[PDB]
Motif scaffolding. Structure first.
Motif, short mmCIF file in Angstrom:
data_model
loop_
_atom_site.label_atom_id
_atom_site.label_comp_id
_atom_site.label_asym_id
_atom_site.label_seq_id
_atom_site.Cartn_x
_atom_site.Cartn_y
_atom_site.Cartn_z
N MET A 89 18.40 -7.32 50.38
CA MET A 89 17.78 -8.88 51.30
C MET A 89 19.17 -9.86 51.02
O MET A 89 19.63 -10.24 50.11
N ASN A 135 18.30 -3.00 66.23
CA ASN A 135 16.97 -3.29 66.40
C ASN A 135 15.54 -2.47 67.37
O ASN A 135 14.52 -2.24 67.16
N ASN A 173 17.40 -22.70 50.48
CA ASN A 173 16.58 -20.92 50.51
C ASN A 173 16.57 -20.16 49.20
O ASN A 173 15.98 -19.63 48.67
N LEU A 199 12.02 -14.11 55.03
CA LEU A 199 11.17 -12.36 54.87
C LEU A 199 11.39 -12.51 52.79
O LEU A 199 10.61 -11.93 52.43
N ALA A 200 12.35 -12.99 52.49
CA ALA A 200 13.00 -13.03 51.09
C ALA A 200 11.84 -13.20 50.14
O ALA A 200 11.58 -12.57 48.96
N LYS A 221 24.41 -4.76 53.22
CA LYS A 221 24.45 -5.69 54.86
C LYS A 221 24.89 -7.09 53.52
O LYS A 221 25.46 -7.71 54.72
N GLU A 252 23.56 -4.82 67.58
CA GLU A 252 22.07 -5.50 66.60
C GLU A 252 21.17 -5.19 67.65
O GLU A 252 19.81 -4.95 66.58
N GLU A 273 19.86 -16.59 61.19
CA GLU A 273 19.94 -15.47 60.91
C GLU A 273 19.60 -15.16 59.53
O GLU A 273 18.33 -14.78 59.31
N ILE A 274 19.98 -15.63 58.55
CA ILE A 274 20.08 -15.97 57.33
C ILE A 274 18.98 -16.92 56.87
O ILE A 274 18.60 -16.07 55.94
N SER A 302 15.99 -14.12 57.80
CA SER A 302 16.07 -13.11 55.97
C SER A 302 15.73 -14.08 54.61
O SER A 302 14.90 -13.11 54.42
N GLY A 329 22.73 -11.84 46.97
CA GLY A 329 21.23 -11.51 47.82
C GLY A 329 19.94 -11.46 47.30
O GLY A 329 19.71 -11.55 45.66
N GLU A 382 16.09 -1.76 49.10
CA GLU A 382 16.31 -3.20 50.03
C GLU A 382 16.76 -3.78 49.55
O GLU A 382 17.16 -4.38 48.75
#
Lengths: 365, 420, 156, 48
Positions: free
Chosen positions: A35, D37, A85, A312-313, A235, D33, A305-306, A309, A347, A33
């Motif tokens: 991230m 999605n 972050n 989420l991280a 990614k 995207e 957007e990050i 992320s 990441g 995964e």
């Protein structure tokens, strides 16, 4: 070859009234995964980005307000929010610990997962393979005014934090996080994790080395599946490529004339005398400003957007790492018994210790 | 920040550099005296259908006979401004002289071909020097008639830039090599009829086209300037054949070519100079510069400040501290100490304290500060425990920690009358 | 004052230009901040549903202890979260024996580890020192005595 | 969008650099995207 799609995996069943598929054995699948935790910490000397100088150039800089100033505030926010972050993910550690480096427990050669005293790198060789999986295209000093300022946190101390997490996860009991430690003997730990998955603990003893060999073979296969293998890791690198794209775009539009005679300083200053000159200079100012504004705008867009992320991280550091996160396959794609951390340039990676019961039957009830 | 009470933090501000100290000015040793007083002082300059062409090289141009002048009727520099022409060394440039009326001078333009400049001689809108014009009704106007000289006004199609054809075709719309004036068969040539008596648009004017071969050979003609020495490894000025600039020079490490001069690293930069007297060096126009941020503890412990430079390796720091080219110059000014790491660079007011604390001030990469003082970082609460056989942490008393959490709900409901 | 005509309006349109662009710039960043804040607000209501309206069984998302209660407080443009946590504090050092061969067969109590072998007294919590009269209900039938660890007897 | 089929205005467009292309990169990332999605939300049980 051109087709529609084999749309999924075709089967077809209906129900059975009492005869029922009941697993009499099981399996574990640890997953990748990717991230991206923090994109490239970059800033601009806008005052020299535009306007290396003439001097008249700097006068017209004054004549279009504090755009440079506001974008410097913008960049400061950009960097600082990356750092936020980075922190908010990273040092969630109350008490740091020490890597015991005895390195065979339960059944587990944990090699390259933690790093080694025996190696000069304090970085774990899995992550170092990930470093080898990085592609791209004293001090750095361009004439462009464009910096990749270094991240606050040391990458080795990133690694130290991760390895500390690995330790305190593999140690310290379930209370690891809101507390210090518990000294639970790790068959008893992962025995206790069979109870948040809610099952008996006998089968652990029935499959001591079996689950172990599942596990270490699985890590081996992860090494296999990541060493020379396919693009299912980058990614991160997509984001990196986009940074490069934008920066290169910035420079290549710095190449652009815009209907003036030249497209660079002092070259203009040759053939120029008077404000018509500086009118053309203002065109340069205008377009450079625009592109710059666009740039930093989309930098912030990427940043939003990050930051999603990043949320989420930190989230998967929280629920999935420190506890057994009962939200099903949020973390991985099995049952998520554990998951262990790994790092990356820009990441974080995770090692999703799932659980899958597996031997399909037909038995009545 | 517009305040008098300010709190603590790495606070970013405006930019710096090194003000360039000296200059390196590089010429070749060329000198000759141009036929300016021949190309603009003779009378043998042929017609328009025979538009003249002279070559210029290895000279010295004055640019002084041009501005300090009343001889010229119609002058304008087209590609350039006249003012900074004196600071230009060129190579091998070109001029075209011819005798006209006083009306083609308007159609003498980039584009704008009309008739004679659509049939005899042609430009792009691009490759432009200057254009000079004056009357010579006092050498070239016999009211008896300038029947001597001609142009052409017949052609199949339009012109192409910088082309000359003399061929007086027995011209006809679809070929027909004729004996003119057999019908539909003429010639393109035509006289001038220049009279001494006539007015502005019709007296013979000598007009010169000034095409400037720029930066396309190592510069043979120079303007009246003087070359200098070299200055290795110091933030100074550049002034080359046409290349001034600002930065630092140092020799190459490269594989250069005989025709060659410039390098333009990612774009339009020249990157390097083959010096006009046989050297081949790099360019680093970025001397050292960039941003700064200050550290102060925030008006409730002290008012002592410390300065973060962000693009240095502590080389030129104490230099321009004492070489006095730092644009946030200070009268409140010392030279105390410097910590060298975080390759952004040099931080003034600081000591490498080996013992490390909880990282108040996040210096760059790993490094952090306190009091002031500064260390790298204590990474966190280092303990050292591990696995156990059976003995195990169990709780018997406890705590409850109510904490905050701080979240917005919505920013401000604003709006704008754009129409006011 | 010193204008009438389209050169006037040229300067005017430059004003229009710059004010338009900076105006749009404002607006664009406004919408950016709106997006940031609305996602955070989604999280906020999410917690308000979660932390306040129930005992959120997921751990350390509401607070940073164990979420006993959660008490919300408004604020100008904001909101405040009193996370009544639980953090345990009096650390012990006690020993165990996980599987119990009491009558010749293995025993696991309740899925819910550490059979308290502080002289084999009780079987306890995840998170406390607790006295429990041990039962068969506090174990199960697990085959025979083959991979057992503890050999404890007198199992009441 | 800007001059639909042009002669001069294409050269002017080049004199505005390469902007069209960059905006198309944005467009592509959008559509990429979008259906990313689409896959993400819906292609969940690959077992049909």
């Amino acid at each position: 070859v051109a087709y529609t799609m084999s749309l999924g995996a075709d089967s077809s069943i209906a129900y059975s009234n009492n005869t029922i598929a009941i697993p009499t054995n099981f399996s574990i699948s640890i997953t990748t995964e990717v991230m991206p935790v923090s994109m490239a910490k970059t800033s601009v000397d806008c005052n020299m980005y535009i306007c290396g100088d003439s001097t008249e150039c700097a006068n017209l800089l004054l004549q279009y307000g504090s755009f440079c100033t506001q974008l410097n505030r913008a960049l400061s926010g950009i960097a600082a929010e990356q750092d936020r972050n980075t922190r908010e993910v990273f040092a969630q550690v109350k008490q740091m610990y020490k890597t015991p480096t005895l390195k065979y427990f339960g059944g587990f050669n944990f090699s390259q997962i933690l790093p080694d005293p025996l190696k000069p790198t304090k970085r774990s060789f899995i992550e170092d393979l990930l470093f080898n999986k990085v592609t791209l295209a004293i001090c750095a000093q361009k004439f462009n005014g464009l910096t990749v300022l270094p991240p606050l946190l040391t990458d080795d101390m990133i690694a130290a934090y991760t390895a500390a997490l690995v330790s305190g996860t593999a140690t310290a009991g379930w209370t690891f996080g809101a507390g210090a430690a518990l000294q639970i003997p790790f068959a008893m730990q992962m025995a206790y994790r069979f109870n948040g998955i809610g099952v008996t603990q006998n089968v652990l003893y029935e499959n001591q080395k079996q689950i172990a060999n599942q596990f270490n073979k699985a890590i081996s296969q992860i090494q296999e599946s990541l060493t020379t293998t396919s693009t299912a890791l980058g990614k991160l690198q997509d984001v990196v490529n986009q940074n490069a794209q934008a920066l290169n775009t910035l420079v290549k539009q710095l190449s652009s004339n815009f209907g003036a005679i030249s497209s660079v300083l002092n070259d203009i200053l040759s053939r120029l005398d008077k404000v018509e000159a500086e009118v053309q200079i203002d065109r340069l100012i205008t377009g450079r400003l625009q592109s710059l504004q666009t740039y930093v705008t989309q930098q912030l867009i990427r940043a939003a957007e990050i930051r999603a992320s990043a949320n989420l991280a930190a989230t998967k550091m929280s629920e999935c790492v420190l506890g057994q996160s009962k939200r099903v396959d949020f973390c991985g794609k099995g049952y998520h018994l554990m998951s262990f951390p790994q790092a990356a340039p820009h990441g974080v990676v995770f090692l999703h210790v799932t659980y899958v019961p597996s031997q399909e039957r037909n038995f009545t009830t | 920040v517009k305040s008098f009470e300010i709190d603590k933090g790495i606070y970013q501000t405006s930019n710096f550099r090194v003000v360039p100290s000296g200059d390196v000015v590089r010429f070749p040793n060329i000198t000759n005296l141009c036929p300016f007083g021949e190309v603009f002082n003779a009378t043998k300059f042929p017609s328009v259908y025979a538009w003249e062409r002279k070559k210029i090289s290895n000279c010295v141009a004055d640019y002084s006979v041009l501005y300090n002048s009343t001889f010229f009727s119609t002058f304008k520099c087209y590609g350039v401004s006249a003012t900074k022409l004196n600071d230009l060394c060129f190579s091998n440039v070109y001029a075209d002289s011819f005798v006209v009326k006083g009306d083609d001078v308007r159609q003498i333009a980039p584009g704008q071909t009309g008739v004679i400049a659509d049939y005899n001689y042609k430009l792009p809108d691009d490759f432009m020097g200057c254009v000079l014009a004056w009357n010579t009704r006092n050498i070239d106007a016999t009211s008896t008639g300038n029947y001597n000289y001609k142009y052409r006004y017949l052609r199949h199609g339009k012109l192409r830039p910088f082309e000359r054809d003399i061929s007086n075709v027995p011209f006809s719309p679809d070929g027909k090599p004729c004996t003119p004036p057999a019908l539909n068969c003429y010639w393109p040539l035509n006289d001038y009829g220049f009279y001494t008596t006539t007015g502005i648009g019709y007296q013979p004017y000598r007009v010169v086209v000034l095409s400037f071969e720029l930066l396309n050979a190592p510069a043979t003609v120079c303007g009246p300037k003087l070359s200098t020495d070299l200055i290795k490894n110091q933030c100074v000025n550049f002034n080359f054949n046409g290349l001034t600039g600002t930065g630092v020079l140092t020799p190459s490490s490269k594989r250069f070519q005989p025709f060659q001069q410039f390098g333009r690293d990612v774009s339009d930069f020249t990157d390097s100079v083959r010096d006009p007297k046989t050297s081949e060096i790099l360019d680093i126009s970025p001397c050292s510069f960039g941003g700064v941020s200050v550290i102060t503890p925030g008006t409730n412990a002290s008012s002592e400040v410390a300065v973060l430079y962000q693009d240095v390796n502590c080389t030129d720091v104490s230099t321009a501290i004492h070489a006095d080219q730092l644009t946030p110059a200070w009268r409140i000014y010392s030279t105390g100490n410097n910590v060298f790491q975080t390759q952004a660079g040099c931080l003034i007011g600081a000591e490498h304290v080996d013992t490390s604390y909880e990282c108040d001030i996040p210096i760059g990469a790993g490094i952090c500060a306190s009091y002031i003082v500064a260390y790298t970082m204590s990474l966190g609460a280092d303990s050292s425990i591990a696995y156990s056989n059976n003995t195990i942490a169990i709780p018997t008393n406890f705590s409850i920690s109510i904490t905050t959490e701080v979240m917005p709900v919505s920013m401000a409901k604003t709006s704008v009358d754009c129409n006011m | 004052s010193r204008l009438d005509k389209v050169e006037a309006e040229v300067q005017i349109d430059r004003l229009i230009t710059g004010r338009l662009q900076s105006l749009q710039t404002y607006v664009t960043q406004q919408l950016i901040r709106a997006a940031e804040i609305r996602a955070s607000a989604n999280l906020a209501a999410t917690k308000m549903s979660e932390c306040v309206l129930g005992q959120s069984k997921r751990v350390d998302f509401c607070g940073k202890g164990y979420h006993l209660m959660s008490f919300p407080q408004a604020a100008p443009h904001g909101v405040v979260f009193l996370h009544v946590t639980y953090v345990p504090s009096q650390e012990r050092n006690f020993t165990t024996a996980p599987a119990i061969c009491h009558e010749g067969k293995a025993y696991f109590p309740r899925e819910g580890v550490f059979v308290f072998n502080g002289t084999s007294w009780f079987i306890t919590q995840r998170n406390f020192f607790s006295p429990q009269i041990i039962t068969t209900d506090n174990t199960f039938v697990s085959g025979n005595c083959d991979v057992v660890i503890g050999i404890i007897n007198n199992t009441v």
